[PDB]
Design a protein around this nucleic acid. Sequence first.
RNA 1: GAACAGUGGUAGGAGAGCGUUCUAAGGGCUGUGAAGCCAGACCGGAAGGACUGGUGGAGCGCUUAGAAGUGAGAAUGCCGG
RNA 2: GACCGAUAGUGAACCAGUACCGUGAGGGAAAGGUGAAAAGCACCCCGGAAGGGGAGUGAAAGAGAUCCUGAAACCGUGUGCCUACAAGUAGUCAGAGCCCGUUAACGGGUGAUGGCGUGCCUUUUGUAGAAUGAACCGGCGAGUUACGAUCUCGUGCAAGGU
RNA 3: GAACGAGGUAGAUGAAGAGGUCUGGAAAGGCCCGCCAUAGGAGGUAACAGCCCUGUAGUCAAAACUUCGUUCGA
Lengths: 206, 146, 102
Amino acid sequence: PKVALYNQNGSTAGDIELNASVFGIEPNESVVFDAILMQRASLRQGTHKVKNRSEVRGGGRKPWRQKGTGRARQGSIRSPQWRGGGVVFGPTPRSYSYKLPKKVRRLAIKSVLSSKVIDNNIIVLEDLTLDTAKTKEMAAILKGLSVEKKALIVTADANEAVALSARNIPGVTVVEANGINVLDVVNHEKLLITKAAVEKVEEVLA
Amino acid sequence: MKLHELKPSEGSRKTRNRVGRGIGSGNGKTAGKGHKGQNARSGGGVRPGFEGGQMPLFQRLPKRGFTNINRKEYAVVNLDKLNGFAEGTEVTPELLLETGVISKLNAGVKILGNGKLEKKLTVKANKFSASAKEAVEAAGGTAEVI
Amino acid sequence: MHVKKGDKVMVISGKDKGKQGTILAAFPKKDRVLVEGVNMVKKHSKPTQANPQGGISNQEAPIHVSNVMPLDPKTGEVTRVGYKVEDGKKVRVAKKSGQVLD
RNA sequence: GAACAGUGGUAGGAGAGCGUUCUAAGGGCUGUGAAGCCAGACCGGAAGGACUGGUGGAGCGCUUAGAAGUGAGAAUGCCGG
RNA sequence: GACCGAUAGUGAACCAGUACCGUGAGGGAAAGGUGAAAAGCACCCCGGAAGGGGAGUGAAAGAGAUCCUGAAACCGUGUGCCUACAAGUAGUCAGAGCCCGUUAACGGGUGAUGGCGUGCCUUUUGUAGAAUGAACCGGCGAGUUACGAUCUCGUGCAAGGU
RNA sequence: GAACGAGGUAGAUGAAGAGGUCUGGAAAGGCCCGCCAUAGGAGGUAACAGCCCUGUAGUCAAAACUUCGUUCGA
Ligand SMILES: [K+]
Ligand SMILES: [K+]
Ligand SMILES: [K+]
Ligand SMILES: [K+]
Ligand SMILES: [K+]
Ligand SMILES: [K+]
Ligand SMILES: [K+]
Ligand SMILES: [Mg+2]
Ligand SMILES: [Mg+2]
Ligand SMILES: [Mg+2]
Ligand SMILES: [Mg+2]
Ligand SMILES: [Mg+2]
Ligand SMILES: [Mg+2]
Ligand SMILES: [Mg+2]
Ligand SMILES: [Mg+2]
Ligand SMILES: [Mg+2]
Ligand SMILES: [Mg+2]
Ligand SMILES: [Mg+2]
Ligand SMILES: [Mg+2]
Ligand SMILES: [Mg+2]
Ligand SMILES: [Mg+2]
Ligand SMILES: [Mg+2]
Ligand SMILES: [Mg+2]
Ligand SMILES: [Mg+2]
Ligand SMILES: [Mg+2]
Ligand SMILES: [Mg+2]
Ligand SMILES: [Mg+2]
Ligand SMILES: [Mg+2]
Ligand SMILES: [Mg+2]
Ligand SMILES: [Mg+2]
Ligand SMILES: [Mg+2]
Ligand SMILES: [Mg+2]
Ligand SMILES: [Mg+2]
Ligand SMILES: [Mg+2]
Ligand SMILES: [Mg+2]
């Protein structure tokens, strides 16, 4: 699709034609849901455990004889109904990761990119280039592009100065073209992407 | 999508049933297991195929046959699949495998005679059905064994 | 601590906000200081061997060190603290002016 | 929306929901008083939900989705009173 | 860290492998929170003291050490309605009288008297059961997870899929 | 055996608001304004702090002991 091309300073240098196979598909909402859920599950560390009745300290002996005392029969002071007892079926360390088919992954990232173009929240830049790695300059650039809220900045390769300048601004994330991903795209209002990065994204996804 | 307005595909996700959580649910108390007996017990139930001591079906019936060490399975290709190639193509196992017409070679390609072949082809395969050889030669082509 | 016994400071936070005084004592371990005329308390002391009258007594209670700032020598306004080395000897400097504090 | 019919129920099958803790994203509330607690003649078909006042003195809802140590009146249950 | 938050999480947030138990091997607890700061209540009064009542401090003392909150059982003080001719699974529906006055509703409290009415749970052909379980209140306390299988539903791609 | 380099075992330096004003026991909160940011990790501070403190990013540092690296007969 046809989109305005901008400079850093915020002046429009004509238009650029984004590949329709990437930026012009009908977004598959069910696929994007699945990709978001899958990606958030991948982030979980899953480090959680309880002690069952075997793992709690002590508890070997029968607390009192089976018959004759008038008490309920009990097998261990760490049986699960005892205060201080083992837990029945609590958490155990585990992974929550699973893989979607590679074609579903392709669809999902195309969907959210193509949805950014519909919502007019893509900003293609001629190039993005800071003289000094200075946060004040990045903040000025984002002001100029009318980037009020959160934004994902996508460069073709690692750009140390852009990375460093945006690092400390809240809700701005810098990423290489390789590093683009569904959750980062959907969780930033504006997508600032360089023309070099657009070409690099198209290369892979188309 | 927006992370604040996520919505699963209708019919993609159901709520799990949680038994033994009160009478209103319809699986309170006995948790759907009925009353007593081996099937209601924790860890309970007889092993698969057990018939409570009646001689199990598998044990009533005789073992049959043997397995050949040297069994050959061929990747079979019917004539309809050869129809997808270009005219005058030298169809080989390596091409079939590369194009994705077959997934695994196994003992070799065998050509079988299901469907119709219009296109003339030089088919090189390990085996042919009598039908398939005839059908390849009838279309003008060649059925070389390799 | 960024201030020490004898420093003139301004109280920047509390009931005594905007009150200047001298640090009478520092308590590094608690990160508190005692500032003259600041954070006065009425201690109800019984008769002892030392003071056999007893009575209620107005004394300073210490405040958190992060509620005081040293004053800039030049302007007389609160300053943050830096360190430079003069004559092979480290000194505190008012970040506001550049002037040495001590 | 109309008509017509139906709606006792144990084991049990099926469905639709309520509430709890945590997370993410919106959005909010709160020292001009959060949660909790106490009280009331309010609201919803139920699970339940508000509002007002008191106590309390710093945290907490809401929406959508996710994940579960997710709901107790009984076990001569365990611990405390 | 879509792990715990003081019955949890380590047995152990605290002087815990302690105290305590056992000849011994060994078993094995309970017990966190004044306040921002001790400013931890000078002084007066009752009392032998404990403990109070003032006065002070403090935002707060009904934050005073048994010190954040402060439920329930349980124990009391006061009193609006009822109660000493009555036969009671204790309610429910009917109902005067008396006392009140609300999230304002064909309201609230009490209840002479009338009708009806054998708790709950478990287990049973059948339980008010003279069968079982629970003194009461509170907290804790039971279909989970992993890896495989299969079916339904959903999605992607499709003679291919991965 | 030495030399050199990078580490470890202490540390050092380190930007920017007591901004005004409201409520309050207290302001880190509200409202209205600034500013720093290779630093908006964290903890603390009389309520919730990038700019109050300890710090953080970055940049430096070792007498001594120690780790690793580098160099010096078909
Ligand atoms: K069942
Ligand atoms: K309240
Ligand atoms: K019980
Ligand atoms: K314990
Ligand atoms: K009656
Ligand atoms: K009996
Ligand atoms: K401070
Ligand atoms: Mg054991
Ligand atoms: Mg016996
Ligand atoms: Mg435990
Ligand atoms: Mg079911
Ligand atoms: Mg049933
Ligand atoms: Mg039951
Ligand atoms: Mg049973
Ligand atoms: Mg039976
Ligand atoms: Mg059965
Ligand atoms: Mg500083
Ligand atoms: Mg009926
Ligand atoms: Mg809570
Ligand atoms: Mg549970
Ligand atoms: Mg109980
Ligand atoms: Mg507690
Ligand atoms: Mg414990
Ligand atoms: Mg002994
Ligand atoms: Mg109170
Ligand atoms: Mg408090
Ligand atoms: Mg208390
Ligand atoms: Mg009579
Ligand atoms: Mg009478
Ligand atoms: Mg009778
Ligand atoms: Mg019988
Ligand atoms: Mg029995
Ligand atoms: Mg009994
Ligand atoms: Mg410094
Ligand atoms: Mg407070």
